[PDB]
């Protein structure tokens, strides 16, 4: 059965703004991307699915348990031990007053590692995995560049080996070369592991490079379920064609 | 009973509320039990939370021992002892052995605390993570969520910033295996003394109005890492009076040019050793 | 901050004995009783009652006697003594319309229904020192008139029935209690008034004077000053009906301030409010003026004077806090200064070799 | 409608003077076995004022308030609440409150205790009002 | 119609509080409240002393039907001025006998995740608290282990031994019998043994 | 037709009569003397002397008695009396080094020459009302020690000779006198100090407390 | 002590400091420090002001009669 099931999730804090009648199934090892305009509400959907925003109506199932039926402690633990979140701004997801090694090992300490040497070794290993130099582990995110900060955030999220990671356009604000290298690293990590990835992006290039299946959201409703190299090259819905033409 | 005043200087309503809070705290070790008392002005800074607890729990038959940084000769300790002599008339002693109530500021006595004793600690701040979390709304809930890893961050980065754990005062602990409590700014030397103590320890913060207690024989363990276990640096300098170096040593300044000496903080244990 | 100090018990006790012997003064003279102080130094007792927070004449006079006439120390003593008392009840809201007037004036009209009742007041006296008070004498006989009080409606009722001002309506909001929870700024007007009633008279006087001179002007008019006895009532749980427990002598000041032009309401006057124990009225007038000044966020007028600054005005009006701060600086800080000495000396070496 | 009369005589007792009340009660030579169920306690009463005299409530300090309770032999409870710290005065007021609820003492004490005290207080209030109204400022007078 | 409270409220309340603190901080210990010489029947001396020393206007009391009484309610409302409720849900100091129903106990407030001290404090009167099923106590407040054999109904025995409310949530039991009292907080590891 | 009549002078005279009756208070009590206020309300006298501008304890006590304890009213009484008197002379600048010390303390140095001397003070006292003062009594017999006073040079003299402070040296400048001419901002330090010594103590205490922030 | 602290605060201009708070504002502090002036000019509101207030009343009545009717 699909790892994550979404059924009739709707939330409209303001008229038009938000999302409605959103449903989809996500299986492990598959990357599901979301494409839409600024007002499509895809960010609201990402917040709602990641145990942050309570939907007005709908049901989200993880494994066999409803997402929002669980207690606050259960969802808080899930957001740190088995789920990952990569915000667009690394500082939002990174603790500024904590070194890179400290940020990486915060999840392990929360799990109850209680071992400075093992925590530091794991932090160095993850920094090497995300290409960050290990010599500057004691350094802090403020001194790291945008790409390095994004890599540190990815390492922090993946230190717990989560089976589901949401990514609210981490590539925003990065150069073309840096963005491409980061996307390649993300694809390598995804293929190496069996964790599902939900990527929200405002451009089709990121979905083409990383995402496996694609969905389109317009004015807060799903328009047409997509697939890599099919919607991008053979858009069916007129709005999808308009988006493709605008991108091109 | 001081003329014109209630016994122990506190109105019976504040006493009753603090007593109820103390009982709740005992039933929930390590939890900072709120109490909604009034605002009371006091001359000496120490007392906003310690004097209140002492007044709530002190009786006519108690023997009171007031301690400031381990010493009974301190001006504030003498003032508080005299205040309680005036408003309660209780007996006061210089010995941890003969005391039944020990009001202390930032120090556990060297002498082991026996049964039928209560030790009260003034707590300037009752929640250690106030230095990290500004908003208290998440602070209350994270205790139930058990998210005590955040306070581990300062311990982790202390060695990075200094090469060793320098948090020798107000070192956080986990009591009953559940609740992370921060005692008064007692030294690291005294943190071990809190492990399954025979006596009932009470902690009271006034400026925040939170009470937490450690029932006797309650397991409290220092928060640290397995790779960096909680260790107390052994003292390699003696006391200028009795010589013994088995007790935490404080510094007393003798001149205006910086000259000073080390003497046992717990003057009672110092006198016990000297008279030996 | 907090320097632990040892070895002064004997000296401290001797100093306290000296202070008490000086408070008693020369034993040839009689001992200044508390009834004498409350009867004959009534205005000092008014100020101490208002600032300390207990409307008991005898307690305030006792605190004044203990403090050797010092008002700040007496206020400290009374405020501390307030801690040992149990809150037995909360009174019904005072109805100043029922006040038994000892004095009532209005500066906004030449005459008003009820009359300009001067009452006891030092106003219009020529401040020439009276040396006959250096010996005993006899108080003047009090000329009598009609032993009746005419209807004395509040002048603001008259102004509001004309539409020139707004009635202060009761929204039912629960008053804030600083005596239970420390203030958080910005604080509601009830909290502001509670803190103003407890503020130092000589500091709120200066803030009101600054507003008058143009540091946050509010165009004040003494719309009404009243001084008289008001019945206090409670509703005990044992019973179910309101009982009258006595009367308090209090002074109420209603200021008429500059008019505004609301977007969708006729122009009207604003108003400050002051309320104090006893007949010390300059405190009530300063309270009303600073109340109007601190109403700036309510009226959406940006502050241009220190008296319009809420944090500055309220965070330092308390005598106890400022007195404790100043007293701490006296305490032995031998160690802390030694730290400063080393810090200063290094700067001297670095900038001067 | 005994609530209004009880309020009246309770207020007359509270507003009385301890000297006046004590002297008159001693003169009455009236006493019945009573027990102080509540010992006379002096605490605080919080003063509640109104903004502008008619607006929202705010707190205007505290006053001293003494309260006592007495139970008579038959079980009638008399309470007192008097501003100040005179505990014997509060006990006397509670005793009179209890007695006034007994049919034997209601009319007798109203004629001999409560009405005279109210009259004396009114007399001194009227005298003070005369002295105060001597200070009135006159501007205009009707002329025929 | 009214019952006399502590002869000396201040010192008697302080002594009762110290005895209750000894009982609570050391679960299983038996302490005697010699202060009050006569309880408010059907309440025993221990329950009356606890209510007098702890109950006030901020502590609603829920007397159970067998223990609820007009004289008891009047005396409690007079001496302590504490509000009186009739449903266990809103109680803060619940009082019940060995006939306590399982539903009544389950309705008692146990606290909250953010306010674990906001729950009720059940007080239980028993015929005796020394003769009954053997019970071993350990945990916070216990030196090594204490043996108590009090006469509890099956419902509260199940609650103690199989506490369904996770720490810090849970009520704090107070056994009472005549002058003698015993305290079992929510943190006591209690087993049948 | 509401003919205007005169009631002003007869109003203020009656008001002042009522005020003096209130001042005398209950007549069954002895009228408190100026000497009693001077000897026992000595801190009120000190404040009135400092703010009123005349260092005359009897005059300050008289002002307090005439003001019904109102410190501001007594201060203004003494200030108005200042205008009555003529300036007979100007003293030589005061020498505080030759003080006969009732009290001498320092918070920076422990071993100050001349020794620390707490003297009469309210410091370290418990703010507990002494209800025994509701009745007559007498203060405890004073303890005695050595009767000699050692020389007591200023602490700032030590700080200056150590290079940590600057010695305040007189340049011979003529002090400003606000009592002769109105203040003209900006003011010299002499004018500021003269004004401050006359400043209300509550206002200055609040300003000092605000400088902490 | 309060006089010493306020004197040091008012020494700002000669130390080349910037007034951060009213206490260091020379004119505000000194103009209102005098007890007699502040007390007199606050208590003077008890003086009749019906001539001045009548001028205010006339303007407000004219403003009310034009804002609405
Ligand atoms: Zn030693
Ligand atoms: Zn300090
Ligand atoms: Zn004017």
Author numbering:
A (entry chain J): 3 to 250
B (entry chain H): 3 to 278
C (entry chain G): 1 to 353
D (entry chain E): 3 to 146
E (entry chain F): 2 to 194
F (entry chain C): 1 to 213
G (entry chain C): 285 to 353
Sentences from the paper on this structure:
Here, we show using single-particle cryogenic electron microscopy that PhnJ mediates binding of a double dimer of the ATP-binding cassette proteins, PhnK and PhnL, to the core complex. ATP hydrolysis induces drastic structural remodelling leading to opening of the core complex and reconfiguration of a metal-binding and putative active site located at the interface between the PhnI and PhnJ subunits.
3D classification of the data collected under ATP turnover conditions yielded structures of two additional states of the core complex bound to PhnK and in some cases PhnL. In the other structure (open, 2.6 Å, 31.280 particles, C1 symmetry), one of the two PhnK subunits has moved away from the closed position by 25 Å while the other has stayed in place. Due to the tethering of PhnK to the core complex, this movement also results in pulling one set of PhnJ and PhnH subunits away from the rest of the core and in that process exposing the Zn2+-binding and putative active site located at the PhnI-PhnJ interface. Due to this flexibility, PhnL could not be modelled in the open state, but inspection of the 2D classes confirms that it is present and possibly in a closed, ATP-like conformation. On the contrary, no ligand density is observed in the Zn2+ site in the open state, which has undergone a rearrangement, whereby the loop of PhnJ that interacts with the 5′ phosphate of the ligand in the closed state has been completely remodelled, allowing His219 from a nearby PhnI chain and the N-terminal NH2 group of PhnI to complete the Zn2+ coordination sphere, which is now tetrahedral (open). Meanwhile, His108 of PhnJ, which interacts with the 1,2-cyclic phosphate group of PRcP in the closed state has moved ~11 Å away from the metal ion. There are very few internal rearrangements in PhnJ and PhnH, which appear to move as near rigid bodies (rmsd = 0.6 Å between open and closed state structures of these subunits) except the PhnJ loop 37–49 that lines the active site pocket and appears to help accommodate the rearrangements around the Zn2+ ion.
